[PDB]
Design a protein around this motif. Structure first.
Motif, PDB file in Angstrom:
ATOM      1  N   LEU A  34     -13.444  -5.804  -9.955  1.00  0.00           N
ATOM      2  CA  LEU A  34     -13.629  -7.008  -9.158  1.00  0.00           C
ATOM      3  C   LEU A  34     -13.930  -6.655  -7.702  1.00  0.00           C
ATOM      4  CD1 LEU A  34     -10.213  -8.624  -8.254  1.00  0.00           C
ATOM      5  CD2 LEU A  34     -10.406  -6.232  -8.950  1.00  0.00           C
TER       6      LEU A  34
ATOM      7  N   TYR B  98      -5.254  -0.671 -15.948  1.00  0.00           N
ATOM      8  CA  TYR B  98      -3.904  -1.100 -15.596  1.00  0.00           C
ATOM      9  C   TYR B  98      -3.013  -1.069 -16.832  1.00  0.00           C
ATOM     10  CZ  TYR B  98      -4.951  -2.502 -10.813  1.00  0.00           C
ATOM     11  OH  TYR B  98      -5.289  -2.500  -9.480  1.00  0.00           O
TER      12      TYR B  98
ATOM     13  N   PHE C 296       2.950   7.151 -15.890  1.00  0.00           N
ATOM     14  CA  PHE C 296       1.821   6.984 -16.793  1.00  0.00           C
ATOM     15  C   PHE C 296       0.642   7.861 -16.397  1.00  0.00           C
ATOM     16  CE2 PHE C 296       2.293   3.515 -13.774  1.00  0.00           C
ATOM     17  CZ  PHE C 296       1.134   3.593 -13.035  1.00  0.00           C
TER      18      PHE C 296
ATOM     19  N   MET D 288      -6.314  11.468 -15.141  1.00  0.00           N
ATOM     20  CA  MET D 288      -5.965  10.951 -13.825  1.00  0.00           C
ATOM     21  C   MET D 288      -4.457  10.750 -13.797  1.00  0.00           C
ATOM     22  SD  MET D 288      -7.292   9.789 -10.900  1.00  0.00           S
ATOM     23  CE  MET D 288      -7.326   8.492  -9.668  1.00  0.00           C
ATOM     24  N   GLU D 289      -3.781  11.411 -12.861  1.00  0.00           N
ATOM     25  CA  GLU D 289      -2.330  11.512 -12.883  1.00  0.00           C
ATOM     26  C   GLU D 289      -1.675  10.562 -11.889  1.00  0.00           C
ATOM     27  OE1 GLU D 289      -1.373  13.601 -15.226  1.00  0.00           O
ATOM     28  OE2 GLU D 289      -3.430  14.322 -15.517  1.00  0.00           O
TER      29      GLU D 289
ATOM     30  N   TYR E 156       6.981   5.149 -11.528  1.00  0.00           N
ATOM     31  CA  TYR E 156       6.831   3.791 -11.028  1.00  0.00           C
ATOM     32  C   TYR E 156       7.804   2.860 -11.738  1.00  0.00           C
ATOM     33  CZ  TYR E 156       2.762   4.930  -8.245  1.00  0.00           C
ATOM     34  OH  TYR E 156       1.918   5.453  -7.293  1.00  0.00           O
TER      35      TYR E 156
ATOM     36  N   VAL F 106       9.045  -4.064 -14.355  1.00  0.00           N
ATOM     37  CA  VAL F 106       9.833  -5.203 -14.822  1.00  0.00           C
ATOM     38  C   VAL F 106       8.917  -6.092 -15.652  1.00  0.00           C
ATOM     39  CG1 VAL F 106      11.627  -5.287 -13.039  1.00  0.00           C
ATOM     40  CG2 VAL F 106       9.417  -6.373 -12.643  1.00  0.00           C
TER      41      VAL F 106
ATOM     42  N   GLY G 298       6.437  -8.343 -16.741  1.00  0.00           N
ATOM     43  CA  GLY G 298       5.275  -8.991 -16.180  1.00  0.00           C
ATOM     44  C   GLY G 298       4.576  -8.174 -15.117  1.00  0.00           C
ATOM     45  N   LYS G 299       5.236  -7.147 -14.590  1.00  0.00           N
ATOM     46  CA  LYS G 299       4.662  -6.326 -13.536  1.00  0.00           C
ATOM     47  C   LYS G 299       3.720  -5.294 -14.137  1.00  0.00           C
ATOM     48  CE  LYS G 299       6.426  -5.078  -9.052  1.00  0.00           C
ATOM     49  NZ  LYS G 299       5.028  -4.818  -8.633  1.00  0.00           N
ATOM     50  N   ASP G 300       2.592  -5.069 -13.470  1.00  0.00           N
ATOM     51  CA  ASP G 300       1.563  -4.172 -13.981  1.00  0.00           C
ATOM     52  C   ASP G 300       1.161  -3.136 -12.939  1.00  0.00           C
ATOM     53  OD1 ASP G 300       0.461  -6.178 -12.414  1.00  0.00           O
ATOM     54  OD2 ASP G 300      -1.318  -6.459 -13.657  1.00  0.00           O
ATOM     55  N   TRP G 301       1.421  -1.871 -13.234  1.00  0.00           N
ATOM     56  CA  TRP G 301       0.930  -0.781 -12.407  1.00  0.00           C
ATOM     57  C   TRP G 301      -0.231  -0.092 -13.107  1.00  0.00           C
ATOM     58  CZ3 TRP G 301       2.881   0.379  -7.519  1.00  0.00           C
ATOM     59  CH2 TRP G 301       4.049  -0.301  -7.162  1.00  0.00           C
ATOM     60  N   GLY G 302      -1.106   0.516 -12.318  1.00  0.00           N
ATOM     61  CA  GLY G 302      -2.259   1.178 -12.886  1.00  0.00           C
ATOM     62  C   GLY G 302      -3.184   1.681 -11.798  1.00  0.00           C
ATOM     63  N   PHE G 303      -4.351   2.148 -12.233  1.00  0.00           N
ATOM     64  CA  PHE G 303      -5.307   2.815 -11.359  1.00  0.00           C
ATOM     65  C   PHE G 303      -6.538   1.941 -11.157  1.00  0.00           C
ATOM     66  CE2 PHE G 303      -3.794   7.144 -10.588  1.00  0.00           C
ATOM     67  CZ  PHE G 303      -2.695   7.171 -11.418  1.00  0.00           C
ATOM     68  N   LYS G 304      -6.701   1.423  -9.944  1.00  0.00           N
ATOM     69  CA  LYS G 304      -7.948   0.785  -9.556  1.00  0.00           C
ATOM     70  C   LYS G 304      -8.962   1.874  -9.222  1.00  0.00           C
ATOM     71  CE  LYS G 304      -9.750  -2.537  -6.130  1.00  0.00           C
ATOM     72  NZ  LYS G 304      -9.522  -3.062  -4.756  1.00  0.00           N
TER      73      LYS G 304
ATOM     74  N   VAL H 197      -3.745   7.216  -6.613  1.00  0.00           N
ATOM     75  CA  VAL H 197      -2.754   6.265  -6.122  1.00  0.00           C
ATOM     76  C   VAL H 197      -2.650   5.154  -7.164  1.00  0.00           C
ATOM     77  CG1 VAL H 197      -4.264   4.685  -4.820  1.00  0.00           C
ATOM     78  CG2 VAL H 197      -1.923   5.221  -3.921  1.00  0.00           C
TER      79      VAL H 197
ATOM     80  N   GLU I  75      -1.471   0.833  -7.199  1.00  0.00           N
ATOM     81  CA  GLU I  75      -0.940  -0.385  -6.605  1.00  0.00           C
ATOM     82  C   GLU I  75      -0.642  -1.412  -7.690  1.00  0.00           C
ATOM     83  OE1 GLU I  75      -3.912   0.800  -6.375  1.00  0.00           O
ATOM     84  OE2 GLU I  75      -5.463  -0.731  -6.175  1.00  0.00           O
ATOM     85  N   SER I  76       0.015  -2.490  -7.277  1.00  0.00           N
ATOM     86  CA  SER I  76       0.657  -3.396  -8.218  1.00  0.00           C
ATOM     87  C   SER I  76      -0.185  -4.598  -8.637  1.00  0.00           C
ATOM     88  CB  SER I  76       1.978  -3.892  -7.628  1.00  0.00           C
ATOM     89  OG  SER I  76       2.533  -4.912  -8.434  1.00  0.00           O
TER      90      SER I  76
ATOM     91  N   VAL J 203       9.503 -10.431 -10.932  1.00  0.00           N
ATOM     92  CA  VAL J 203       8.172 -10.983 -10.692  1.00  0.00           C
ATOM     93  C   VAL J 203       8.118 -12.387 -11.280  1.00  0.00           C
ATOM     94  CG1 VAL J 203       5.724 -10.821 -11.233  1.00  0.00           C
ATOM     95  CG2 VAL J 203       6.982  -8.771 -10.575  1.00  0.00           C
TER      96      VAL J 203
END
Lengths: 344, 94, 342, 37
Positions: A60, A71, A86, A101-102, A107, A110, A112-118, C3, C5-6, C153
């Motif tokens: 996006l 993500y 991850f 990609m490390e 992290y 909880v 609904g929370k989403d971490w990942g790589f943009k 990196v 982000e959330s 959240v």
């Protein structure tokens, strides 16, 4: 004033993975950030904590207009935090990770929370046929997670030593009577086809079956029963749930497995199927899901489908499904009208 | 006769359950509700206890003539088990 | 540039409760070094099945705290999860005022049984002084203000999962229904004459050795009857309600022979938790017995942990008569332990 | 329709509403649409 623990903590690291393929990626055509989510995948042991994966086919906004953001999203948990770490990688035709990609630190997740790589990888570079990342235009991604639990030494004398219990494979051992088929006792039948299966686990796990085996059958026809009401492609999934205690191929074929489960009172598979349908709700088929959930005596599905229709009555009303449910099944409509009235 | 201050005999100690709620008004320039018309949020809750259920409430063009060209935001308590809450609140725009 | 982000605005859910603990005649504790006086378990009320307790050692520990009082928060119970709490300790004087208030700088991670506290919380000599008024009528009143950060959240864009309330993994309860009612088994075992009834599928599935006796040379002639004449029935009952229900409650009380039973029929998983149970009951007076049992039955994890324990604690094991008996009669066990210590 | 929208609390018990449910679905659907909206 620095606090200290005065105890020994074991840094437990539960690891798992879930390979995932999207069909016909080049033609998905979901732009401007439209997400393309996967189906929930558990972490082997402890199925009360379900994960999931998320993708945006075109990154996006202007800054990431060329990449393919990726993500990892947690779906459910028992109101507590997890501390996963991850790693994302792509498996080529030979199956060897190339674009690893490390994540440099654990992290905290909880519900609904989403971490990942943009900006995970450029789509054009990935679409390049020279790289060979799309055999049969498929896009295969491998996600490796490592949940850190950090238990504290099991309260006892001394402090502790290392290496805890290796998460006993009770479920698979129970399952091990079906694929190898391991000398059963009674012969089933699915519309002429031949299947072999036991009696103890069936009677234990399905009360309707237990009532079936003892009353009028165990004296005369104990070996053979003919089942002419279900298709075998889902009979295999019910009879890999009764044995192995988990259903992989669940979100694809949840429509008739609910009917079969409610017929034989398999409550746990019924509730997971209810969760699977609830996560696949849409305006174009909420009427069909509600009809199936009332005919097959689901409760949670009627409540969640009625709530969804209450929110999205703007466009559900136009759908042909709504006309069908109005003409054919009035009392469900009346029940929905009471659900709205109670809400209003 | 008399009647000074009433003692408590116990020390004063309080609980505070502080949570949050993020509410997104998509296509807010196209909502177009006129003077005095509300737009109510979806029911939300704390998480510690679901007995109390809250929901925000906007009037895109402020009610009453004093707030002719203002956004009026309210916090509402939908349902409680026949008891009175003493909650604090603060709103802000991301 | 690795990196992550959330994409979700950081939201927090803090539950800030407190607790007031009073200790009667605190100067009458007999005040022995290393002592502990635990408080009663307390909870916020909206705890979600989560119990704490303070812990005072009236005399300190080791060297630097001998003239101090140490106060530790302790998470007694929690539903198998990490808790991230911010704790504060203070003492109320005679005038109902917080005096020794010192907080925790950041939120510290709690898991069931883990205790976070401040060593050297207060000088004991200053505490006992009557000019400070900290002990009205020799009564110590401690005050704790916990703050359980949760980092939730909560957004308006759908509830996805919503209410699931799925049933827990009760796959043991149903299995436990094949045993007491005994539900028409197929083959008869025997433990030194007594009669028990049990199946073949679960046994063959979970214990390969059971499959090798049952399939090979007996299914033609002696299919009904086999005699297991090498173990006592009081532990065989536990063995075959572990094979069935998938958990052994009365294991730590009698873990000495469950290892023998598990290793005899090669149940590796049962062998490993039993080795874990024995390893947690290690002591200098019986480390030799645990090591010999772990060597005779070819245990590895228990053997390694017993060898390490004896290596650390060779100071006093040497005096015990068990060590001398095993040294005089079976030399080769001594040599690998000696080599490890080298 | 408006009266039923306000007073749907007690009309549901009445046999007439059940008669419309068995015999006239589309009126129930239209009342639902009005109460929604």
């Amino acid at each position: 004033p620095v606090a200290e623990s005065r105890c020994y903590t074991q840094i437990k690291v539960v690891k798992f993975s879930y390979m995932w393929t999207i069909n016909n990626f080049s033609f998905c055509r979901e732009e401007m950030g439209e997400v393309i989510k996967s189906s929930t995948f558990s972490s082997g042991a402890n199925d009360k904590l379900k994960w999931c994966l998320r993708v945006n086919p075109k990154g996006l906004d202007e800054e990431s207009k060329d990449y393919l953001s990726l993500y990892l999203l947690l779906v459910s948990c028992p109101k507590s935090e997890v501390r996963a770490k991850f790693k994302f990688s792509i498996l080529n035709a030979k199956g060897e990770e190339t674009k690893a990609m490390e994540s440099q630190r654990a992290y905290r997740f909880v519900q609904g929370k989403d971490w990942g790589f943009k900006k995970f990888i450029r789509r054009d570079f990935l679409l390049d046929e020279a790289n060979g990342l799309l055999p049969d235009d498929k896009l295969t991604l491998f996600c490796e997670v490592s949940v850190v639990q950090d238990s504290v030494n099991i309260s006892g004398q001394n402090t502790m030593n290392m290496v805890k219990v290796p998460e006993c494979r009770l479920a698979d051992e129970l399952g091990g009577l079906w694929e190898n088929s391991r000398f059963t006792d009674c012969c089933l039948c699915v519309a002429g086809q031949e299947f072999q299966a036991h009696k103890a686990i069936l009677a234990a796990r399905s009360p309707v079956f237990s009532a079936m085996f003892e009353h009028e059958m165990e004296e005369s026809k104990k070996n053979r029963v003919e089942i002419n009401d279900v298709e075998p492609e889902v009979f295999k999934e019910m009879m890999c749930f009764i044995y192995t205690g988990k259903a992989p191929n669940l979100d694809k074929m949840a429509d008739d497995l609910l009917a079969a489960a409610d017929k034989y009172a398999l409550e746990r598979l019924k509730v997971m199927c209810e969760d699977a349908l609830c996560s696949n709700l849409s305006v174009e088929n909420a009427a069909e899901i509600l009809i199936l959930a009332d005919l097959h005596s689901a409760d949670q599905l009627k409540t969640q489908a009625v709530d969804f229709i209450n929110y999205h009555a703007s466009d559900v009303l136009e759908t042909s499904g709504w006309k069908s449910m109005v003409v054919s099944h009035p009392h469900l409509v009346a029940e929905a009208y009471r659900s709205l009235a109670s809400a209003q | 006769s008399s009647g000074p201050v009433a003692e408590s005999r116990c020390y004063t100690q309080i609980k505070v359950v502080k949570f949050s709620y993020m509410w997104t008004i998509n296509n807010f320039s196209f909502c177009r509700e006129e003077m005095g018309e509300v737009i109510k949020s979806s029911t939300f809750s704390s998480g510690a206890n679901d007995k109390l259920k809250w929901c925000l409430r906007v009037n895109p063009k402020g009610l009453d003539e004093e707030s002719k060209d203002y956004l009026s935001l309210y916090l509402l308590l939908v349902s409680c088990p026949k008891s009175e809450v003493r909650a604090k609140f603060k709103f802000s725009i991301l």
